[PDB]
Amino acid sequence: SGPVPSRARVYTDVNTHRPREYWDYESHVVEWGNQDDYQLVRKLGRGKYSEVFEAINITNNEKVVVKILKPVKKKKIKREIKILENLRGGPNIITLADIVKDPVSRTPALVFEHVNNTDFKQLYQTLTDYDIRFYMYEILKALDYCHSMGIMHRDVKPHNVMIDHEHRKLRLIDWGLAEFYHPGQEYNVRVASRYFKGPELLVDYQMYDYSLDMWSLGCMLASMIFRKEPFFHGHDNYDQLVRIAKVLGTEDLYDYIDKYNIELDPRFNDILGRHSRKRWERFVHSENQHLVSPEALDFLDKLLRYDHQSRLTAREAMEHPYFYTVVKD
Ligand SMILES: COc1ccc(/N=C/c2c(O)ccc3c2oc2cc(Cl)c(O)c(Cl)c23)cc1
């Protein structure tokens, strides 16, 4: 009775071999800077958990980004800080430069390196086939790094990938939903943005792992090579799974939930239907064919699999022939 357990197939026990303080973020003691070192310039955005500003370090005229955390969840605050410090210096991980106490909100304000980002809505319309492969490889470097450090991002999406296209620089940002992977642990399924939620989240399977990020990455790849953003455009979390099933088919979906002894929410009875798997060539047309190759479709197919245990890992993905044409380092 109940779901079948699952474990990551890589980096499974990295945290249990760590000192407790590495992953015990509740015990972390924050070292504070001087908030008056930074002057806010303009607000860049606001979400449920933070407000983000362009700012200047007034001690050396340096551009920085300041993320003022909202006082909603406090252990979520220590979690993000500890993860950012643990991952600092890793390939294409945003660098946390300082932590100050904002005088107005009385909450932590995170100071990050600045990236000359262009909005993905404008940038993805300009990317060549080579650019897509290049930036995909850069994202994979960041994902393999954090996974190898025992951390899943859980909010991979174009909005959380800052790209300075003039300088071909990429940073993975917003670690507010990131979590330490502990084998056998049941996690909250209310993570990631709707269009990038893995099937495991949508069927309410809690014992997921780093492979969630690889589904989200596959969703990004599909939107880039097919020029369709987002690729799976659900109107809610239930319709999101139906949209996936209209592409991947319902037979493999039922095989997936049967393998883990998962029972679908009965509200899917009236909306899921019966769908064959579609060949990826259905989504190729004159406006995206220059972005599609046999290698791209083979890669995408190995990311967008219902069974989280069957997806390519970040390291395996970097070995894929899709990246043979990319000059590295
Ligand atoms: C011209 O319009 C723009 C130019 C740059 C621009 N840069 C945002 C930016 C950054 O350069 C580094 C880190 C973050 C940024 O936004 C974030 C949000 C969250 Cl939530 C977060 O955790 C992090 Cl680390 C960052 C945003 C708009």
Author numbering: 2 to 330
Provide text from the study.
In order to elucidate the binding mode of 4b, 4a and 5 to CK2 each of the compounds was co-crystallized with hsCK2α1–335, a fully active C-terminal deletion mutant of homo sapiens CK2α. As expected, all three protein matrices are structurally largely identical and the three inhibitors bind to the canonical ATP/GTP site of CK2α which is located in a cleft between the two main domains typical for eukaryotic protein kinases (EPKs).
In addition 4b and 4a contained a flexible connection between the dibenzofuran scaffold and the methoxyphenyl moiety, in contrast to 5, in order to evaluate the impact of planarity of the four ring system on inhibition of CK2. By this method, the IC50 value of 4a was determined to be 7 nM and the IC50 value for 5 was determined to be 5 nM. The Ki app values obtained thereby were 0.41 nM +/− 0.02 for 4a and 0.46 nM +/− 0.09 for 5. Consistent with this rule, each of the tight binding inhibitors 4b, 4a and 5 forms four hydrogen bonds with hsCK2α1–335. A further note deserves the fact that Val116 is in one of its two H-bonds the hydrogen donor, but in the other one the hydrogen acceptor: this is only possible if a hydroxy rather than an oxo group is the H-bond partner at the inhibitor side. Intuitively one would expect that a relocation of 4b’s Cl6-atom to position 9 as it is in 4a and in 5 would bring the chlorine atom into the proximity of the hinge residue Glu114 and should therefore generate a Cl-O halogen bond with the peptide oxygen of Glu114. However, with respect to halogen bonds 4a and 5 differ significantly from 4b since they fit so perfectly to the structural environment provided by the enzyme that a strong novel π-halogen bond is established which reduces their affinity to the subnanomolar range.
